[PDB]
Design a protein around this ligand. Structure first.
Ligand code: LJO
Ligand code: LJO
Lengths: 304, 304
């Protein structure tokens, strides 16, 4: 009973957080095996951030300029390289706490947990989603750069995000663990605007199935729709167009509840056209889109 | 920038989760030093739960009947006792991962993180609040009993909750780590109804201060109020009455923003009387009450 915005247990990621200092800039690093991953802007001063030439700035840096501290002990840096927008610092010690891991580049609409860190120390964990405009609505202050996003499948941590930037609109931009930014953002102190933040339709439907499973059924109506009719409504409300791929992934939820995907689409259509009318669904007064169909299945079944 | 419902990093609690089996019932245990804490209803069959006499049921149980498994290794049980609604299983090995810890009985309105577990394995972490009717709106399925609630102050874990029950209304009831239930609930399969779920006023105000700090200011008005005038409105909307103690704890937020507590109360009063008018605050279309003033301060300052 009950449905919560749950994050993955963070322990496996906590054992990987280190502090990286270069000059007078300190941020977070991710220590996996004998490599520490961190945003390349760690080599920048506030002035450098205006228009940095990272290759040129890196020439003035040696292995001894990167100070890596795991807890209260100093790691010896024996190599450094730049891969896209991340720095890989080869250390002389493999992290004894390295979990089974993969680096994955996620698609917009996918969810993940963020372990927010400051000075290599964790402050908290929350569940996020890569928005369709490639930003994340996180909670990050100065010093939080290098904090990571991830998913867990039993014992394997799939790292998907590394925090780099706060846009002037308070939304967040970052990279995958290969250093490639999600979206068109660059690691520069220049005004970069985000595109339309559309609603992740398939996630809203998955959350409506979670609500039915947990007792909230008032929004179920006597109607059905078609993908094309539904998508005309989704276009009007800045919702992502629903495809047969999305319908397919909702299949297990449609099967468990006995509510056909297109019937749930008609409920969503009426909710979009009429609003909630002062009512709530799973304790929310708006349509939640940061639960994927896989998250709903996982939570509703007790996957550990 | 940004404000999220954050949970504490769960690592320190993950290293304490064990599986406890008695007969054919399996639930979660908390292993701290050489003691494993678990709900006493682990000794019950589904039939026993209807009207259990725990002292009588415990007589038919020996140390060897309690199977404690931490990961894939079996702990030897050398003692067992019942303290209120929890069983304390003395094991022959101190948990090497025992963090610095305290057992605290929280007050209604206080928030905490829950590490949801199944068969001694964690499934996720989420932030909760002890409701004013002493229930929690968690996310727990069968097998989740023994999962714990906690807060962290730097390196010390204050355990405050242990999950025991799901009421017929899908809300959750549990105990502190001394085995005393929050509220009037009993560990029996008998219909127990919850009292009025009032809104935690001081938490809503703290969240309104977080919203101002983060850019959402539309709800700020030209009015002020008094504690007595505000409380007449709070009574009507089933909000907890605000006291000078609550005003005092909001002080640092009033000081940082320059918005007097009673002015924020007048904004809250207008929001209660007029609604949001299709608008949102920190991405929510309702007034959030599961952030204490301490949580807002912590998140907005970067406490690790
Ligand atoms: C101040 C802050 C808070 C949260 N996330 C990110 C930031 N800051 C940034 O985006 C930086 C830029 N541009 C400033 C230093 O290099 C990265
Ligand atoms: C089914 C479930 C799911 C989540 N939390 C709790 C429960 N169940 C309960 O409350 C129990 C009772 N009464 C059933 C066995 O003893 C505790």
């Amino acid at each position: 009973s009950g449905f919560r915005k749950m994050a993955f247990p963070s322990g496996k990621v906590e054992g990987c957080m280190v502090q990286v200092t270069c000059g007078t800039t300190t941020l977070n690093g991710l220590w996996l095996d004998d490599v520490v991953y961190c945003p390349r802007h760690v080599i920048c001063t506030s002035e450098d951030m205006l228009n940095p030439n990272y290759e040129d700035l890196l020439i003035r840096k040696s292995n001894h300029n990167f100070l890596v501290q795991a807890g209260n002990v100093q790691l010896r840096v024996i190599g450094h390289s730049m891969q896209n927008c991340v720095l890989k610092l080869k250390v002389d010690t493999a992290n004894p706490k390295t979990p089974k891991y993969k680096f994955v580049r996620i698609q917009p609409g996918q969810t993940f947990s963020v372990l927010a860190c400051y000075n290599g120390s964790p402050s908290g964990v929350y569940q996020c989603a890569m928005r369709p405009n490639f930003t994340i609505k996180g909670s990050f202050l100065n010093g939080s750069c290098g904090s990571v996003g991830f998913n867990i499948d039993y014992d394997c941590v799939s790292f998907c995000y590394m925090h780099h930037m706060e846009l002037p609109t308070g939304v967040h931009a970052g990279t995958d663990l290969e250093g490639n930014f999600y979206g068109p953002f660059v690691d520069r102190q220049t005004a970069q605007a985000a595109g339309t933040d559309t609603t992740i339709t398939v996630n809203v439907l998955a959350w409506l199935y979670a609500a039915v499973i947990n007792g909230d059924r008032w929004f179920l109506n006597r109607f059905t729709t078609t993908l094309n009719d539904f998508n005309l409504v989704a276009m009007k409300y800045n919702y992502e167009p629903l495809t047969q791929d999305h319908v397919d992934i909702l299949g297990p939820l449609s099967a468990q509840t006995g509510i056909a995907v297109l019937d749930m689409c008609a409920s969503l259509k009426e909710l979009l056209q009429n609003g909630m009318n002062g009512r709530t669904i799973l304790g929310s007064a708006l349509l939640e889109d940061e639960f994927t169909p896989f998250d709903v299945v996982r939570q509703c079944s007790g996957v550990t």
